[PDB]
Amino acid sequence: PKSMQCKVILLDGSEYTCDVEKRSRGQVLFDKVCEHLNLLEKDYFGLTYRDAENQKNWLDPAKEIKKQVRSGAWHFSFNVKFYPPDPAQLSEDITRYYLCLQLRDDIVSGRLPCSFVTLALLGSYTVQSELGDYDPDECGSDYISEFRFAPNHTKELEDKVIELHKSHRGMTPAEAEMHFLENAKKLSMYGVDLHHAKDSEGVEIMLGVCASGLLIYRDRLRINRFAWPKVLKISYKRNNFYIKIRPGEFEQFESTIGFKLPNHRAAKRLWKVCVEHHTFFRLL
């Protein structure tokens, strides 16, 4: 029974290696990674892989791995797929811990924009969880942490992390991680998956997929929002993605809204993540 070597980048930046039978479904690999991580609340998470042009796709746990990675290497990342709108309602601390690791990379990568003060507050809770109580011995007036906190580190930001870290004396790691999450969950781009597109007039927009629905960011005009319960059908055709905005009160007809994506694969990818979010965030 022939087995393929899998390499998975974990949210701590380390590499997990395992083997699965070459005809394995994505769930087989995901179960092995989640067991390695002691993760029970697995529904929020998934595996990604970089495609024949370094774009990230979700590995579908119900489909053969080989029919997804196709000609590419069996190399994956472990990631949050569905960002819980209220992380305090997760059953296990270790789930919150992995969500913190994902958010820390969302912040350093700049996918999750963050004010100076929130960068320093989030950083202060991470230091508290990892190192425990502030120690002056591990920090002179010239201290720079090993912790990556932000897309662009400054001495001012390092100083503000230390100032806030001093305020958290006696805080336990689960407690610090919950405070991290209480702040992060409020950020306007928390759990927003952004996709480049054009409106029906060729004007560049971003479409954001998240728990609360689909976001249109036209930038120069406004930000339109479609709560999932106002969305009846999602579809793609060629390079186009369409959303049927259910007819409101006393309106005769449903309404359909169309977008142009970079290529057909980018339309299919946006359709699949919307369908998955619609399903997941209907069951809350």
Ligand X SMILES: CC1(C)CN(c2ncccc2F)C[C@@H]1O
Output the smallest distance, CB 198 to ligand X, in A: 9
Output the smallest distance, CB 240 to ligand X, in A: 18
Pick the closer one to ligand X by CB: 218 or 237: 218
Task: Judge contact between 21 and 3, C-beta under 8 A.
Answer: yes
Output the smallest distance, CB 220 to ligand X, in A: 8
Pick the closer one to ligand X by CB: 43 or 204: 204
Output the smallest distance, CB 196 to ligand X, in A: 7
**Residue with smallest beta-carbon separation from ligand X:** 219
Pick the closer one to ligand X by CB: 58 or 217: 217
User: Edge-to-edge strand order for the sheet containing 255-260?
Assistant: 223-227, 213-217, 204-210, 193-198, 255-260, 240-245, 231-237
Please state, in angstroms and rounded to a whole number, the distance separating the CA atoms of residues 138 and 167.
Answer: 16
Pick the closer one to ligand X by CB: 100 or 270: 270
Output the smallest distance, CB 238 to ligand X, in A: 22
Pick the closer one to ligand X by CB: 222 or 238: 222
- How many residues are recorded in the chain? 284
The two beta strands, 75-80 and 3-9, are: parallel
Residues making contact with ligand X (CB under 6 A):
194, 204-206, 217-219
Q: What is the DSSP string of 2-48?
A: -EEEEEEE-TTS-EEEEEEETT-BHHHHHHHHHHHHT-S-GGGEEEE
Output the smallest distance, CB 237 to ligand X, in A: 23
Indicate the SS3 state at residue 176. helix
Pick the closer one to ligand X by CB: 139 or 187: 187
Number of Cα atoms under 13 Å in the Cβ half of residue 202: 0
Q: What residue has token string 């010239």?
A: 142
Q: Phi and psi of 33, rounded to 5°?
A: -65, -45
Task: Judge contact between 270 and 241, C-beta under 8 A.
Answer: yes
Neighbours of 15 (CB within 10 A): 9
Output the smallest distance, CB 281 to ligand X, in A: 20
Pick the closer one to ligand X by CB: 217 or 280: 217
